[PDB]
Design a protein around this ligand. Sequence first.
Ligand SMILES: O=P([O-])(O)O[C@@H]1O[C@H](COP(=O)(O)O)[C@@H](O)[C@H](O)[C@H]1O
Ligand SMILES: [Mg+2]
Length: 221
Amino acid sequence: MFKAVLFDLDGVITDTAEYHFRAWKALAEEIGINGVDRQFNEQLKGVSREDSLQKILDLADKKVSAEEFKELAKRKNDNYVKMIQDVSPADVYPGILQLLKDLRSNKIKIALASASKNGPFLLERMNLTGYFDAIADPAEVAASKPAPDIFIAAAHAVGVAPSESIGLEDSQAGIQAIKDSGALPIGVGRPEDLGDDIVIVPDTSHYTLEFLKEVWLQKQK
Ligand SMILES: O=P([O-])(O)O[C@@H]1O[C@H](COP(=O)(O)O)[C@@H](O)[C@H](O)[C@H]1O
Ligand SMILES: [Mg+2]
């Protein structure tokens, strides 16, 4: 049976992917880049602060100085951090709190595999910190999503092999990271964005221990 569930945070645990999108779009427009719309944003979900900024800057022909680059990333984060100050337990996505309780009752490890340095703060805002057996620090891995490092680290942090773990993600980059880690991915979002090669659910209410078991018993190979 699987022995661990590796949780992405933003867009899985709570609608915080929407906040990252709005913050990145605002930053981009401030520097005259209007290409960050929902479609383009799918390429930003799951990627690190610096990687997100560079993907946005790639839309421009000229480059910014190292000094401006650093200021831009900080500017976006300062805005994002203000945006999430009022997040509360009421903001936890449907099914997530129950899933955490069910996993603990069944002795299945719970680890956070978020690329966000604001992850710990958000779990505290939502009164979810106590459910996690481990939080993989995104600053410790040598390579961020789509690299599998963070999921491999989350699994190791709870003493479980990635091959015996399920990863929950809402992004293209994150799903790739799960795939290359050896864990089984179950994405949440629309088929047009995440693919038709893995199991995808339309919303988090589908993330029940019953369903994770249903899917796991159906894994290939
Ligand atoms: O989706 P998950 O939880 O990997 O989290 C990811 O965290 C990145 C870095 O976050 P921060 O700027 O707060 O360090 C964000 O750019 C990305 O949009 C978000 O999906
Ligand atoms: Mg996400």
